[PDB]
């Protein structure tokens, strides 16, 4: 351990935006944490983002308003932000700084883990081969969730992405026909959203297995880019040291990206698109890739990093770079929500990278893969027919086209529409698939071999 007394400085050189620059510092350490006291007694903390000679640049989490130049007192902890973690953090509510806000005590650590974490050795990483039953046909059928998968929900402001995440928390089980520890990072949200989830977790009777980290819209913007790491660090303890299956949900990741963009501008870093740092991808990978199973240990981490798409732009850097890192996305939209369809999940632009391993003989039912692929073909064609008919008129369509409109209309109300408390099995979802696919004659079901149609199509 660190037995040497820490040093305290009153040597602040200057302040420039969110960065407090100290001089006369003895052997500065990179990415070490500094605790500072303002002339009025206010205590704040920050991290050294640069060292050079006797100088060090400290980014202050709470902010730099009120930071003095002569009376400011800073001390260097001598290490990186290692945070206290314990098993009994489940059932506690913390803020974005890692401190409790539930009137309980501070964390009585079992160990101290580096918030930055470490990359998992790809040779010991074990490829996920188990499916989670979300109960939502729009997901379990056509975009299955594996245990250890990273699947964000791409959403847009005003859409019920909070209700879907809340639903998933209660009715997420297995298809092996199980209590997930949930770590929920509520960052960049209003009180009502955080209270909605907090209340739902108690309503579900599962609060003793839920760890919350809150960082609300009125909280500092710099803490908003460690909150995910605090959640994941706890998840890593629980999953990889105590073999507990953990579900980690990160609320609108766009508030993370916007908080990061503010830091990028302050540090004059090289922009990429829309003003975001050119290293945004690398930073996101540090957050997202803390997931998956590890060989030889019985734990897992599954992520659902829901994000809001600015202006419904699927090419915005936030959903774009996320799409490159995560194993696909669920994607909800306004065209379904504006018709009172719940959950408003649009399967067409969605995918699950681990879905192909998750389905089929030994996992769900042998026809799973065939039903999904044909439903995608029929749904997409129905959308193409609507694009045509909008111009040429119904009279210009033939029987081959009307069948896809019949499918499209029945698909959305039978397959996607469910309700907040409709919990379907994966087998029931496929059965529904067949009920819709049987709208077409065998010759049009071109994604399914006759070795499958001959068994399932007749019913």
């Amino acid at each position: 351990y660190l037995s040497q007394p820490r040093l305290t400085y009153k040597t602040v050189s200057g302040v420039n935006g969110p960065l407090v620059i100290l001089d006369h510092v003895k052997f500065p350490r990179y990415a070490e944490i500094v605790h500072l006291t303002l002339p009025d007694g206010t205590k704040r903390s920050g991290q050294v983002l640069e060292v050079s000679g006797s100088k060090a640049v400290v980014q202050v989490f709470e902010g730099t308003s009120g930071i003095d130049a002569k009376k400011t007192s800073c001390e260097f902890t001598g290490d990186i932000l290692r945070t206290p973690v314990s098993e009994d953090m489940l059932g506690r509510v913390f803020n974005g700084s890692g401190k409790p806000i539930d009137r309980g005590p501070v964390v009585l650590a079992e160990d101290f883990l580096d918030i930055m974490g470490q990359p998992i050795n790809p040779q010991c990483r074990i490829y996920p081969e188990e499916m989670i039953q979300t109960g939502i046909s729009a997901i379990d059928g056509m975009n299955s969730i594996a245990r250890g998968q990273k699947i964000p929900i791409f959403s847009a402001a005003g859409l019920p992405h909070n209700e879907i995440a809340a639903q998933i928390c209660r009715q997420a089980g297995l298809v092996k026909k199980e209590n997930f520890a949930i770590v929920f990072a509520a960052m960049g949200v209003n009180m009502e959203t955080a209270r909605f989830f907090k209340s739902d977790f108690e309503e579900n009777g599962s609060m003793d297995n839920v760890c919350l980290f809150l960082n609300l819209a009125n909280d500092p913007t710099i803490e908003r880019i460690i909150t995910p790491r605090l959640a994941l660090t706890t998840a890593e303890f629980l999953a990889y040291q105590c073999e507990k299956h953990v579900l980690v949900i990160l609320t609108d990741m766009s508030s993370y990206a916007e908080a990061l963009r503010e830091v990028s501008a302050a540090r004059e870093e090289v922009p990429g698109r829309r003003g975001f740092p050119g290293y945004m991808y690398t930073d996101l990978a540090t957050i997202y890739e803390r997931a998956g199973r590890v060989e030889g240990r019985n734990g897992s981490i599954t992520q659902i990093p829901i994000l809001t798409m600015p202006n419904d732009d699927i090419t915005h850097p936030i959903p774009d770079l996320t799409g490159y890192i995560t194993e696909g996305q669920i994607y909800v939209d306004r065209q379904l929500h504006n018709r009172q369809i719940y959950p408003p999940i649009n399967v067409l632009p969605s995918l699950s990278r681990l879905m192909k391993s998750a389905i089929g003989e030994g996992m769900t039912r042998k026809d799973h893969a065939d039903v999904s692929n044909q439903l995608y073909a029929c749904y997409a064609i129905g959308k193409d027919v609507q694009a045509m008919k909008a111009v040429v008129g119904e009279e210009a369509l033939t029987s081959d086209d009307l069948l896809y409109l019949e499918f499209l209309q029945k698909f959305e109300k039978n397959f996607i529409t469910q309700g907040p408390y409709e919990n379907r099995t994966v087998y029931e979802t496929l059965d529904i698939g067949w009920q819709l696919l049987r709208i077409f004659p065998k010759e049009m079901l071109k994604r399914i071999p006759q070795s499958t149609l001959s068994e399932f199509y007749p019913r």
Binding site: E268, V391, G393
Partner: protein
């Protein structure tokens, strides 16, 4: 002359409305998407110019400080 001058009107209307619908549902949306794309990309080019000019001004400031 009613019926022979009438079905020809129904055909002329169907052809005209189909063209109008295409302008509304295909051609203009496509022009608007193109224009919005152009507007966004041009602001992206403006930003990278801002970055370089800002760094140039800072490098000049550093040179000036060294000279003092």
């Amino acid at each position: 002359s009613l019926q022979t001058s009438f079905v020809t009107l129904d055909e002329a209307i169907k052809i005209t409305n189909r063209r109008v619908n295409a302008i509304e549902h295909v051609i203009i949306p496509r022009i608007e998407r193109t224009l919005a794309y152009i507007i966004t990309e041009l602001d992206e080019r403006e930003r990278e110019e801002f970055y370089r000019l800002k760094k140039i001004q800072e490098k000049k400031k550093i040179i000036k400080e060294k000279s003092e």
